Amino acid sequence: MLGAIAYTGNKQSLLPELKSHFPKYNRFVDLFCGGLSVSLNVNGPVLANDIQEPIIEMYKRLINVSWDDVLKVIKQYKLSKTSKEEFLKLREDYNKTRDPLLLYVLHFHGFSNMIRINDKGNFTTPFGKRTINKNSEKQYNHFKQNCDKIIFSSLHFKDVKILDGDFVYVDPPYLITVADYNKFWSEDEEKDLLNLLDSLNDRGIKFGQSNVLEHHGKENTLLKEWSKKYNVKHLEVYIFN
Numbered sequence: 001m002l003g004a005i006a007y008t009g010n011k012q013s014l015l016p017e018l019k020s021h022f023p024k025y026n027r028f029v030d031l032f033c034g035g036l037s038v039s040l041n042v043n044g045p046v047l048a049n050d051i052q053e054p055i056i057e058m059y060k061r062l063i064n065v066s067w068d069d070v071l072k073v074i075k076q077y078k079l080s081k082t083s084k085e086e087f088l089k090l091r092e093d094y095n096k097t098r099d100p101l102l103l104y105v106l107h108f109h110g111f112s113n114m115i116r117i118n119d120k121g122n123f124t125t126p127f128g129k130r131t132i133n134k135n136s137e138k139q140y141n142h143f144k145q146n147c148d149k150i151i152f153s154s155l156h157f158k159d160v161k162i163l164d165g166d167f168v169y170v171d172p173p174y175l176i177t178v179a180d181y182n183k184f185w186s187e188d189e190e191k192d193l194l195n196l197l198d199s200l201n202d203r204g205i206k207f208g209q210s211n212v213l214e215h216h217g218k219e220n221t222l223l224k225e226w227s228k229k230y231n232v233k234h235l236e237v238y239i240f241n
């Protein structure tokens with residue numbers, strides 16, 4: 001099941017596998033939603049949250065965007081596989097105005113379609129010598145057909161209000177994995193995350209955790225020890241109460 005956008009660490013192929021272990025719930029909360037491969041593909045209501053506000057705002061905007069609108073912008077900027085100057089023009093325009101629609105368009109032309117925002121909130125991905133294709137409109141339509149059940153938020157997982165009755169799915173940056181968004185992670189964050197989880201479990205709230213116990217060289221240790229407290233499936237693992 002497709003995510004709304006390409007994303008490092010997406011759960012596109014693993015979703016069907018994880019879903020079988022999901023409990024009943026009043027609301028599904030995708031705490032670190034990322035590219036939405038999970039959010040778009042589970043029964044709602046869904047609360048999709050991610051700390052990267054620019055991306056969340058982009059999703060919020062797409063709610064009332066048609067593929068038509070996307071095309072108009074692409075033509076407006078005369079984007080192609082070699083429009084390096086127009087790409088740069090579009091990038092400046094987004095950095096100055098922060099129009100989420102522009103961010104969506106930009107990503108189709110950035111290197112490897114990856115979104116990179118620095119501390120000031122500017123897009124830094126270099127021109128990717130590419131433009132939209134077929135798979136492009138597919139992910140979009142999939143977004144549009146499944147965004148009704150979703151409410152978006154852009155908060156640190158700590159500030160997210162957890163309600164009785166919801167299932168909290170968490171797929172945070174892997175403390176031992178290579179990825180852009182790891183810049184928000186730290187052993188500190190993980191410690192707080194696991195403590196929140198122990199807390200949810202105490203309220204009777206179900207959660208599910210995706211992560212890597214030991215990928216190449218390095219290994220996650222506090223997790224392996226902490227995971228013993230719960231059930232772990234080996235696919236990378238899935239830890240749930």
Ligand SMILES: Nc1ncnc2c1ncn2[C@@H]1O[C@H](CSCC[C@H](N)C(=O)O)[C@@H](O)[C@H]1O
Nearest residue numbers: 010011032034035036037051156157181184
């Ligand atoms: N403190 C924090 N609070 C909330 N989200 C955070 C965070 N630090 C990092 N994140 C987010 O956690 C995400 C983990 S990657 C999740 C990918 C998602 N499962 C998918 O299929 O696309 C990153 O995209 C990042 O935006």
